[PDB]
Structure 1
Amino acid sequence: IVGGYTCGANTVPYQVSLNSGYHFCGGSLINSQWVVSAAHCYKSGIQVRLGEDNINVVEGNEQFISASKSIVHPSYNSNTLNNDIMLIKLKSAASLNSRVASISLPTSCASAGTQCLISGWGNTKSSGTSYPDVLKCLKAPILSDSSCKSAYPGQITSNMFCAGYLEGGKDSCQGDSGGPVVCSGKLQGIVSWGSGCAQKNKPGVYTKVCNYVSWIKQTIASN
């Protein structure tokens, strides 16, 4: 997260870290057994880390649970990142508490201009590299579809939206992939892709979760 702030320990209790020897992506807990992340975060051997603040220090509220299965969206296209969504099942149910909590799925899509919270352990520098260790947060609005498509002509599908600031300075960044965009208490986005971080006219692009709620619910119910 570039241009954000330190969330505060466990203030985003649905935020998870995906770990394969090291943190490599975010995700969002949607019930005690299931996490939603980006399909481009897929790999084998994932451990889901819940209740994290400092990802380099055991602080006492963590739960580390291996994934038993991953399900990439059937229509995911790795070249264009269309349908950049994946479900991860936990081998044992998380113990839900005030610091480890699920986020509700959308009942409808959110409007342009709605303010959202984006969070993650990614790079905090728009030029160069610095990783923060504690969870960073950013308040950012959903941008109009026309401004999104103007920023990335030929690349935005109906399964994507932009959020952030066309003037730059505040954005998601490397290592935030797969993490949440929450608006009005619902998981509306997944950190998906962009061009650089916090550059003018290059906002972050997010998977449009509201298009996937039926697939999420049916997939969880059958797996």
Structure 2
Amino acid sequence: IVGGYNCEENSVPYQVSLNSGYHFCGGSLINEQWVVSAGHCYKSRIQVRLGEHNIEVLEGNEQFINAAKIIRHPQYDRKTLNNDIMLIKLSSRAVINAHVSTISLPTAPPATGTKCLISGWGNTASSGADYPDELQCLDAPVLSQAKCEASYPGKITSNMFCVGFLEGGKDSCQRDSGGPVVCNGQLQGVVSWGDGCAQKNKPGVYTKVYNYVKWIKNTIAANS
């Protein structure tokens, strides 16, 4: 996250990280045993970490849980990035407490201007590298379909939406992928892609979680 701030302790207790020897993506905890992430974060073996604040210093209440199932949406399109979503089933139930808990699925698709919270351990620099150990947060608004489409001509499917600032300076960035965009207690978005990070007229693009609510429910029901 570029232009964000250090999240308040315990303010984002649904944020998880995906690990394969190092932290490569984020995710959101939706159920004691299920995490939503991006399809492009797919790897064949993933350790989920929950309750992290500083990813370099174990503080007390973190849990590391191996992924038992890693289920990329079967129509994820490696070219257009449509259906960029993935479910992970944890091999053990997460402990739910002050530091770790679940986020609800959306009851409606995103609404323009809604004030949302984007979080992750992505790069804080729009040019070069400045990767933070402490979890970052960014307050950002849902952008109109018009603006999203004008930013990325021809590229914005019905399963994507844009959140952020056309002036630049504030955005998600590398290592935020798969992490949450939360608006009014609901997971609206999955961090997905952008033309760089925090550039003028190039807001971040996010997977539209509402469109996958039935796929998510059916997939969980089938693997329970």
TM-score interval for Structure 1 and Structure 2 normalised by the shorter chain: over 0.9
The residue correspondences of 1:37-56 to structure 2 (distance < 5 A) are: 37-56=37-56
Instruction: Give the partner amino acid of 1:140.
Output: A
Counterpart Cα distance in 2 of 1:82 and 1:40: 11
In structure 2, distance between residues paired with 1:69 and 1:31: 14
1:156-195 alignment, distance < 5 Å: 156-195=156-195
For 2:145, the equivalent position in structure 1 comes to 145
Quote the residue 2:26 is aligned against.
26
Q: Which residue of 2 aligns with 1:108?
A: 108
Q: CA deviation at 1:128?
A: 1.0
The one-letter code matched in structure 1 to 2:6 is T
Q: Secondary structure at the match of 2:29?
A: strand
Q: Which string of whole-angstrom CA distances, capped at 9 and with x for unpartnered residues, describes residues 77-135 of structure 1?
A: 01111000000000011111111100000111121100100000000011111001000
State how 1:1-223 maps to structure 2 within 5 Å.
Answer: 1-223=1-223
8 Å contact from structure 1 (residues 180, 187) kept in 2: yes
1:220, distance to aligned residue in structure 2 (A): 0.3
Paired residues of 1:140 and 1:163 also in contact (CA < 8 A)? yes
Q: Is the 8 A contact 2:110 2:208 kept in 1?
A: no
TM-superposed deviation, 1:9 = 2.9
Q: Whole-Å Cα distance in 1 between the matches of residues 11 and 208 of structure 2?
A: 24
Q: Normalising to structure 1: TM-score of the pair?
A: 0.99
Distance 2:219 2:122 in 1: 29
Segments of 5+ residues of structure 2 without an aligned counterpart are: none
What count of residue pairs does the alignment treat as equivalent? Answer: 223
- Between the aligned partners of 1:210 and 1:85, the Cα distance in structure 2 is 11
8 Å contact kept, 1:10–1:52: no
Q: In structure 2, what is the Cα distance between the partners aligned to 1:108 and 1:23?
A: 31
Q: Which amino acid aligns with 2:81?
A: L
* SS in structure 1 of the partner of residue 100 of structure 2: coil
- Counterpart-to-counterpart distance in 2, 1:10 and 1:85: 25
**1:8·1:135 contact (CA, 8 Å) conserved in 2?**
no
Structure 2 distance, partners of 1:23, 1:44, is 15
Structure 2 distance, partners of 1:29, 1:98, is 14
CA distance in 1 between counterparts of 2:71 and 2:110 reads 25
Instruction: For residue 13 of structure 1, give the secondary structure of its aligned residue in structure 2.
Output: coil
Cα RMSD of the aligned pairs, angstroms, is 0.6
Separation of aligned partners in 1, 2:120 and 2:59: 18
- Aligned-partner Cα distance in 2 for 1:141–1:11: 19
Structure 1 residue runs without a partner (length 5+): none
One-letter identity of the residue aligned with 2:214 = S
Q: For residues 108 and 7 of structure 1, what CA distance do their matches in structure 2 show? A: 26
Q: Normalising by structure 2, what TM-score? A: 0.98
Instruction: State percent identity of aligned pairs.
Output: 74
Deviation for aligned residue 1:75: 1.2
